[PDB]
A paper describes a structure:
PTPN3 is a multidomain protein of 913 amino acids comprising a N-terminal FERM domain that determines subcellular localization, a central PDZ domain involved in protein-protein interactions, a short linker of 30-residues and a C-terminal protein tyrosine phosphatase (PTP) domain able to dephosphorylate protein substrates. The human protein tyrosine phosphatase non-receptor type 3 (PTPN3) is a phosphatase containing a PDZ (PSD-95/Dlg/ZO-1) domain that has been found to play both tumor-suppressive and tumor-promoting roles in various cancers, despite limited knowledge of its cellular partners and signaling functions. We solved the crystal structures of the complexes formed by PTPN3-PDZ with peptides comprising the PBMs of HPV 18 E6 (PBM-18E6) and of the cellular partner TACE (PBM-TACE). In all cases, the overall PDZ fold of PTPN3-PDZ is highly conserved, and the peptides bind in the conventional mode as an anti-parallel extension to the β2-strand.
PTPN3 also regulates the activity and expression of the Tumor necrosis factor alpha-convertase (TACE) protein, which impacts the release of soluble tumor necrosis factor α (TNF-α). In that case, PTPN3 was reported to bind TACE through a PDZ-PBM interaction. We determined the dissociation constant (KD) of PTPN3-PDZ for the PBM-TACE peptide comprising the last C-terminal 12-residues of TACE and encompassing the PBM (sequence RQNRVDSKETEC) following the 1H, 15N chemical shift perturbations of PTPN3-PDZ NMR signals in the 1H-15N HSQC spectra as a function of peptide concentration. The PBM-TACE peptide binds to PTPN3-PDZ with a KD value of 30 μM. An interesting feature of PBM-TACE and PBM-HBc is the presence of the C-terminal cysteine at P0. We observed that in the complexes of PTPN3-PDZ with PBM-TACE and PBM-HBc, the cysteine side chain is oriented towards the interior of the peptide-binding groove, without making any contacts with the hydrophobic side chains that line this pocket. Lastly, the side chain of K526 from the β2-strand is pointed towards PBM-HBc and PBM-TACE, allowing its Nζ to form H-bonds with the carbonyl oxygen of the K or R at P-4 and with the side chain hydroxyl of S at P-5, contributing to the stability of the complex.
Residue numbers in the entry:
A (entry chain A): 5 to 97
B (entry chain B): 1 to 6
Write the structure that this text describes.
């Protein structure tokens, strides 16, 4: 029914990946993609990021016990990265 | 109910 996807994204010139996030352990709501900015890096990588995708790992980090704000920081940290690339393992149904 | 642009 549900399956895991590894998504790999490089930020645009502004530093953004082109998606919005909701949830976190503070939000009593799993952590999920709420928006894909059309034609952004998140929309244009293969495989691509989808609205409603549940975030499982961020750069191999299990984020199930981290706050919303923490996860946003984890996302930003991957621009200062080695490959400057973001690697998300997501779950889709 | 937080929503953040990434
Ligand atoms: Na795809
Ligand atoms: Na990952």
């Amino acid at each position: 029914d549900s399956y895991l996807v590894l998504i790999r994204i490089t930020p645009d010139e502004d530093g953004k990946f082109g998606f919005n996030l909701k949830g976190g352990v503070d939000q009593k709501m799993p952590l999920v993609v709420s928006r894909i900015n059309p034609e952004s890096p998140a929309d244009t990588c293969i495989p691509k990021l989808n609205e409603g995708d549940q975030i499982v790992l961020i750069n191999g980090r299990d984020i199930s016990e981290h706050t919303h704000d923490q996860v946003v920081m984890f996302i930003k940290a991957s621009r200062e990265s080695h490959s400057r690339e973001l690697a998300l393992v997501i779950r889709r149904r | 109910s937080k929503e953040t642009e990434c």
